[PDB]
Amino acid sequence: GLFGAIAGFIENGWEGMIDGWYGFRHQNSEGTGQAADLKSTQAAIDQINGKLNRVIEKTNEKFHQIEKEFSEVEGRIQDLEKYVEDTKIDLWSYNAELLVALENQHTIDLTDSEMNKLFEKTRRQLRENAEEMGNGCFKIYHKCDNACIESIRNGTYDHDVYRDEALNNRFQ
Amino acid sequence: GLFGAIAGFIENGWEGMIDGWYGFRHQNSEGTGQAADLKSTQAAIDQINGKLNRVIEKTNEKFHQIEKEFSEVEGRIQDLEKYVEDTKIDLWSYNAELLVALENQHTIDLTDSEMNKLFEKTRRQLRENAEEMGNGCFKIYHKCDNACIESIRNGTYDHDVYRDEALNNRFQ
Amino acid sequence: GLFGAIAGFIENGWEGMIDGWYGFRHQNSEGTGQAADLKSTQAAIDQINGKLNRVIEKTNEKFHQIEKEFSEVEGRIQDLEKYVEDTKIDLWSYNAELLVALENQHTIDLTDSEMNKLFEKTRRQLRENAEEMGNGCFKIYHKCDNACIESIRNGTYDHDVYRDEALNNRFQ
Amino acid sequence: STATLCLGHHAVPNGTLVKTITDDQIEVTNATELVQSSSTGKICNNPHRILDGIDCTLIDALLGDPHCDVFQNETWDLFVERSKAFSNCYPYDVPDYASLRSLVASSGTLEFITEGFTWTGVTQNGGSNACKRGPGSGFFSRLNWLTKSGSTYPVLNVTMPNNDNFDKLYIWGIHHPSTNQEQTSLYVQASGRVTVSTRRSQQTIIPNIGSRPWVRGLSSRISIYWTIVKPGDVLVINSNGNLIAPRGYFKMRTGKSSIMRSDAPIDTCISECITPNGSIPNDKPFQNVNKITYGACPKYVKQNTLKLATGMRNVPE
Amino acid sequence: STATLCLGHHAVPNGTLVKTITDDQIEVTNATELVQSSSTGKICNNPHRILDGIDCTLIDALLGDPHCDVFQNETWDLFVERSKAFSNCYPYDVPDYASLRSLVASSGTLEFITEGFTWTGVTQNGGSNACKRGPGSGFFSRLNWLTKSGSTYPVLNVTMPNNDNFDKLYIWGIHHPSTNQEQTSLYVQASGRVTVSTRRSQQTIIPNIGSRPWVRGLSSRISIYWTIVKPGDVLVINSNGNLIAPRGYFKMRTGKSSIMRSDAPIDTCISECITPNGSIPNDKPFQNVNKITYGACPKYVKQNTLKLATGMRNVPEK
């Protein structure tokens, strides 16, 4: 994907995470846990439903058309009727093939994009208190309990609180 | 948008900015101010005009074609004449519908992209003298008067002039 | 392109890199050097081949069709026969024109993307030992001989080995 | 002491293969199908008015072949012709059969109004053993077989104005006898003629004596023609032998009506889209069932599957 | 001492909704319309040569119905047929009328050259009450109603070789009397015959006797037929009754000519694209005005509006 996160710097997916599309796995003083991120899971699903509804949107109704099967050989005019329908089918088939190709390429890019959006959002929250290990994981340079992990997970984390502690472990 | 800048990590637009598409707001010891970025504004406008010219270009001319309205019931040949036109119309309609979907999606992504590009260009200039607050704002860690700000806006900011002062406020 | 790298924060390309699509130039105590990155070069090429194999695949075959040239004027049927063909051609030509436009826009974006992936991969390896000068170049803040350079190139660089040396030069 | 916070995304044991711009096959966590491949095999009788032709082609229903009498004045959104339909009355051919079938199919009604045609000097209501109603000979319900009366066949010449505000459709025909012995004993003159004209158009058909393959006892034939009379115009039928005359006219409607060749059973269920293989759901944009369709249908396509990715790329552990 | 630098983008109070791959409706700062849906209501007389048929159909002008004489030798890029048009000469049909209309429309000229047909032993210039030219009896200016001369109608049989380097269009016909009596008073023979042929092609019609509804007093009819003779080929006409002879040929050109049905007034302006509803501008790629068009026109489409975003997503302060 264009962003390098899914099937990129994030080595692989988690079959263990059944409650969302994107999320956090941590390890601290209290042990190890795992939680889905709702906002980003929702962003991906919303856009995919958007795409989907737009393609499942009304067909067109047709009533009396031309005949398309023939029981006798006739010549000029039947050739024409066959060529018109054959041309139409080929054009629609081309349409359908291209459509899923564009859509799918795009679906993979946007999901890759959302994963990266979440990574960047976390990075920014953590400010000067964490470094990126380059595999999806941040190393947080301060003591950080389950309450603290959750403050990151729900975007209330106060970098100032932990700055001195973190700078010390980071640069000493 | 794929980059997460517009309608993303940058909460909203500025209706005040009537002199460009992208820009800067600052608050320094010498006051506040706002100014548009021309290069990025222009980058985005040039691409949109590009799209536009490419689609506004080249209607083709048809002269004698087939009849399309009929004043009596004829049967087989007229059914074909109608089916042919009906088919042509459904296909062009699908073309136009898809054309604007793709274009529009791409215009939103590219404008988003330009926003992000301006951010990243600015971040790069600042080097170690600033930190990224996480909402499109830099906390610049040193005295930056109006000329200092203007040197950022116009690409001439010399991070070395302030590196000492800044690192000092930033760590320690 | 959407990512700001090719014809972006990287001023320009290297006419002198004749053995890959991407890479490195460097300068350490041992002199200067140049080397292709094979993994990224290979990513771009593989995708471009995928695109190409998908367009150049699958000629459909047609046998008996309608006549498409006429020795004498006949009116209604011939009008239709010509309108049908003229319609088919215009639609196929629109398809063809649009296919290259999308494809090419995409090709330019993914190669721009790949350039940016390689930059990010590298930044990540260097952790706190390097700073970005904003033109595609890192300043590595420690003595980094040819084995050190090769280690960054092939993704085995150990930031821990040089961290103290680097932090010291970077801040004190 | 430090903490570790990893970011990730989900994966699944079994993912779906999907096409992109750059790959023929690439695994995603989830996809839906965009091509409808299957039918229940049954045509739903709602919400369209589906008229089962059973034993009859629409043309036989129009003409009024005795076994098709049920269809008098009938009406349809979609008339379904079954492959087993058979003709069982005087043998006939319709020049430009496909057009007549089309224009009637599209009108969507067999509503017939009988008119007071006066045929003075001829015997009306001719019948044949090729076409029985009940015990003895019979004929098309909607046609009137005119033969000599008292040894002469006058030159018939009759009028019918269209004083209504709709178009009338007249079906008529001409008789091709197989021998002059038949020709003369039926029509006196050795050479018949039929002229049927309006203010806007005219047709003259000449009988051709000669023998065709034996069908239901006959080597004769009846040929079928139509005339549409607009409001204000008038019909003139002029003939001195061989006329198969109209008994009146069919109303012509415009609307969503058509015709379809299918042997699929009709059942009680609701489906917008009809195909010769039976109704099909129309949730998906494309379909691979049949290029022949009626109603609100997906667009017929050559592929039998197109998967639309509905999740991210799948990367299993 | 420190500072704050914020990056951002613009917004407007008045967004425009637009469609994307993922959204039915999403607000952008600005957009432009891609479907032309409005018309002045008027066909511009430039740059296309517009011929208003006023009260004549092209066929009636071709045949030379008296009230359509103004049109002799006319030329057009677009022949505009008005719904007010009416026929006022002998009553007639044309089998395959649409085709004749098409081929003349496309040719774009009515240029007619008279030729010296010599009809030996018959009376020329028949005329009818159903087709008055001024005081009395008349007929189509381009057709010659032949009739018996002195109780005999011989087997007509004549040639006209095409010795030019263009195609000749011959218009001719056959007369369908109402009664056997009329048949014989006009042509003597109980049943007439017309055979028009070239080296490669041939048409042969017999007439149809029978009563029909009155049109301008007549129960009788004439059917119109046409023949194209290529350079180096020859016309052969052979009849022993009921021939409505040609008086010559129409020149045949190929070009951008066509025909259109419209009641739109003609006006003075420049507009490349014509439509029955009137001329329309062609700056936009698509149009919703009419599927029938002439010239450089946008492609007809079912949507009445398609917005192309021309600015970023609009995310307003408010």
Added chain:
Amino acid sequence: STATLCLGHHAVPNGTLVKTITDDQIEVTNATELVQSSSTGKICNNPHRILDGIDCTLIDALLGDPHCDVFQNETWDLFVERSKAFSNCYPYDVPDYASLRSLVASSGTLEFITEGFTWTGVTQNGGSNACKRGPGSGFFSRLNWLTKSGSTYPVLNVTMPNNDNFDKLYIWGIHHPSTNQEQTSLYVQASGRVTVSTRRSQQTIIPNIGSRPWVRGLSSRISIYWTIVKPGDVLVINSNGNLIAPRGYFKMRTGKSSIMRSDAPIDTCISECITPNGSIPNDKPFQNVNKITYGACPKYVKQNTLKLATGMRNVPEK
């Protein structure tokens, strides 16, 4: 001490200009062409069965014009008609010629099978100096010209059932004499008739007497018709004069067969795709050579070039 690591991408001196969504022309490192626009000029004789008609048209081969006798029972994947073809037997027209040409072309075989028609009371094998086989008079090899036998021509009324499990194609005809004399000398009846029927169809054609342009000595003509008999159906020919009877039937096949007009030389090579301009390769998705094609061909398109980018944007330092 410090080090410098720079990241970059290649450039080339010879860029290619390409088209995108946002740019009319933009330079990439490399591109490939997607429109095939050239031909060798020659039709490869593999892998399709090519059959060069030389001086014959398919219809003339079908009917059996003497100089086209070579083609009896032939078979083709693609019959190639040359412009130098000429007709050299009795003068004829086929009402609905295009259709007969098309249906035989699609059948792909001239396989003819003689049947035992018995024509009680008429002379067979009529011939003419317009159609010489060898030195003396002749006729279409697959048609049988019937005339009077001993001053009478009785109402012919022959039958012939289809009992095979395949469709039969009958080619028959009718003769249009130039003069009333010629009619009676040949067929006795002053006015003739042909009626050909099955349970499904029937056709009656009535000859029309008169002069047509001189071709190979003749002012008269033959008109060609056709009937397809289904398994289980029966052919009934019935005529009191002027019949040009069939000798048997052609076998009808279905397959990938067709016909093409081209003056391009056949040649020993392999190409899947034929065009009247010659064979063309089919590696590229589109072509600009000819809208007329046969085989596995690129889609015809109006552009003569469409470049697909296969490298990044090109940005040399210079």
